[PDB]
């Protein structure tokens, strides 16, 4: 039971770290998607 | 109508001169670039802290 509890605690900590990293990645990815759409629109009209 | 020639001359004299048009399309591109630069600066300054 103690080993199971320790494993669950470690897994929960790893899950929290992974969730934080995933949230940061999602924020960066949304920013990148917006920037890429903006760049495509600009290049559609920023010729020469 | 012979006198219609005079009317057409008057109408042509009434027409404004379009040669005074300023092709500021380059200024429009400059404004677009300035707006993009301002947006970039605001995004860089979005997080005040």
Min Cα distance A14 → chain B (Å) is: 29
| R_g of chain B computed on alpha carbons | 25
Q: Which two tokens stand for residue A19?
A: 């969730």
- What the block records as the tokens of B13 is 């004299």
What is the 3-class SS of chain B, one letter each residue? Answer: CCHHHHHHHHHHHHCCCHHHCCCCHHHHHHHHHHHHHHHHHHHHCCCCC
CB B46 within 8 A of CB A31: no
A16: its two tokens? 């929290």
Instruction: Report how far apart, in Å, the C-alpha atoms of A21 and of each of A5, A9, A35, A38, B48 are.
Output: 24, 18, 21, 26, 23
Find residues 2-41 of chain B whose CB sits inside 8 Å of chain A. 29, 32-33, 36
- Residue A21 token pair: 């990293």
At how many Å resolution was this determined?
Answer: 3.5
Would you tell me how many other CB atoms lie within 10 Å of the CB of residue A42? 13
- A45 and B36 within 8 Å at the Cβ level: the answer is no
């Amino acid at each position: 039971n103690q080993q199971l509890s320790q494993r669950l605690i470690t897994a929960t900590e790893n899950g929290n770290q992974l969730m934080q990293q995933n949230i940061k990645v999602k924020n960066w990815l949304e920013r990148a998607l917006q920037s890429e759409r903006n760049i495509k629109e600009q290049i559609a009209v920023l010729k020469g | 109508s012979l006198l219609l020639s005079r009317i057409l001359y008057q109408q042509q004299q009434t027409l404004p001169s379009a040669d005074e048009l300023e092709n500021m399309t380059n200024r429009i591109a400059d404004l677009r670039l300035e707006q993009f630069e301002v947006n970039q600066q605001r995004d860089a300054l979005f997080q005040s802290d």
